[PDB]
Write a protein that binds this DNA or RNA. Sequence first.
RNA 1: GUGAACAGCCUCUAGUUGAUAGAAUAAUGUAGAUAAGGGAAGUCGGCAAAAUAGAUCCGUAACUUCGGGAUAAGGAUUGGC
RNA 2: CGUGGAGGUCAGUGACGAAGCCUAGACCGUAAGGUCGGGUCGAACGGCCUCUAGUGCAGAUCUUGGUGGUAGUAGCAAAUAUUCAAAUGAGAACUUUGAAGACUGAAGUGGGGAAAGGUUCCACGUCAACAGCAGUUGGACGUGGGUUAGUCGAUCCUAAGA
RNA 3: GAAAUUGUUGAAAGGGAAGGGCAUUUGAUCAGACA
Lengths: 107, 62, 49, 178
Amino acid sequence: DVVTREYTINLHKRLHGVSFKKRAPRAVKEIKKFAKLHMGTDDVRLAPELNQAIWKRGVKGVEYRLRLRISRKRNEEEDAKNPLFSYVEPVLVASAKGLQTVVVEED
Amino acid sequence: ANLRTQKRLAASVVGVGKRKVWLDPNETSEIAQANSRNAIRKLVKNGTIVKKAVTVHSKSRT
Amino acid sequence: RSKADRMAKMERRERNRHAKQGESDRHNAVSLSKHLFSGKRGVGKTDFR
Amino acid sequence: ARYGATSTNPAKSASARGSYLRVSFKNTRETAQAINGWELTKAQKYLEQVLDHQRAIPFRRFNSSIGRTAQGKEFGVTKARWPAKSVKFVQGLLQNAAANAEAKGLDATKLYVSHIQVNQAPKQRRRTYRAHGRINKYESSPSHIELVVTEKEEAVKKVVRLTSRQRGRIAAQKRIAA
RNA sequence: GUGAACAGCCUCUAGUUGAUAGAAUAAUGUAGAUAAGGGAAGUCGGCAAAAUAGAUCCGUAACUUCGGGAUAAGGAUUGGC
RNA sequence: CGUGGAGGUCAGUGACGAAGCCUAGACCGUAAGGUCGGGUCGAACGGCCUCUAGUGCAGAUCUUGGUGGUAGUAGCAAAUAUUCAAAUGAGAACUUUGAAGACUGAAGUGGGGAAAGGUUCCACGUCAACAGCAGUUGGACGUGGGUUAGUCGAUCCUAAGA
RNA sequence: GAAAUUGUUGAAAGGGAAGGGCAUUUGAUCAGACA
């Protein structure tokens, strides 16, 4: 059931007290878990534009709040997952605060 | 495919180190057929391998 | 050829069980090494650290 | 040919083997005794769940200093572990024995693993280096696997001597009793 | 580039991203730190750690083979525009 | 009493199964030991009267070869660090490309050479073994290709010395 | 294709070792023998 939504995500409360060489690799493993929570899928794809957004301030300067777009899609035949997979891509915004979750309309 | 050859080989043609040459991922079949220096000159100038010009080291603060 | 190629696989087995990394690894294990067992070590200079 | 000692019908039974399989032997003993005697279609889905950390393999014999986990309460043992590389070979043989039964023409639902047996293979001889120039061995323990599946079958006057005195006791009571 | 300097720290050309990994943060460790009041009472013994340090100016003892001792000791100061 | 060979003897037993091996099956001798049945296997071997010796093992910190307990345990922690998609593939923490993040920081993790190694150099194929994890990749394995000199060196001269 | 050693099935026992000796129960098992 293809539904594309916006989300804010509080990375500060998820990276509390994580070793400095392991912060930005860990924030990637949170979003694959965070998109597992809402959409209910396992195979989660992260765009290379989002990988730039996490890693921009080194390993130890991962941002407090991010503004994501999670898209659930149909998957191709002879894939062993199930026919649904998510796709997380970033939306570039002025400030990550003051935003709540919003359904992006379809066309 | 395996493209350690043409990465190395285009570095010798353009005359710049291996950290600079750019091989686009869309043409992964066209580059792999080239196994000679003579094909690499043709593959460079029609815009498949480019140079990636020098990293800036400014001297404005100095 | 497939008659001959399978005879390469039949003759390779004995070297694979001894974990020889080629048909050219003929490093031979000494049964008992002299510096391990021939010594009496008392007060003074000793045979290693 | 020449399996272990089997007490079953060779008519309705397929089988499969694996020779010189380079696994650990102590892991493949335990993941064979977890599966021994189950229904075949229940055994395959179980091994699909062992990979996903849903259900664990109990370790009964080769199990000293294994850490604890909670998923062994189903079997009643605190010590349990998920040997993944052992399952990826053992369920590869169950796919073979299910394929061997279709060639003979047996039922899929009635089939169950009846015999499973694993024992030691000839060991590798690889060497490593220690302190003071000493050369100690560093070797593997590969193993042979064999298994036999079987259909389930829906089923599960001695003359006695006695003395002449005891012969009279039966005759006397039969005379009296109505 | 900073600086007395081929010091240390950061960068350009060039090269590498190899050294088993994943999850949690109990004890005891190995490596590196901070601590109220007292300042060697600790201990075979100030072992170790702390303190001092670059630079300009003022100032320097006993002794001495008259060359040294000497950076003796000790005291003021350091940015920016 | 037993074992290896020798001279006799049973016109001894034997591919219709000789030795060997296994056997909580049977019998004899106080005992060393002897005989029989069953299973395995495939080609020679016994009884008695004597002869002969490299003739009997549990130990020698014995000798060579083989296998365990310990144990799926100790461990695989110096050298600041990896991440996302795509292609390749039966398979990807590890291979290739792109996008990121860092480091060696010109007494370097860079560019060449002397001793020393001898084809490791490069391409094509390709993974049973090795690369203490993995492997589609390699300094691995299989097959081939590749070092051009009147001027660079040796060759010539002499030093301590032979 | 012996033994160490290991696997599977079957039988049996098990409160800080195991195994041994004399006697019998229990279960399993086995030749002999009267015509």
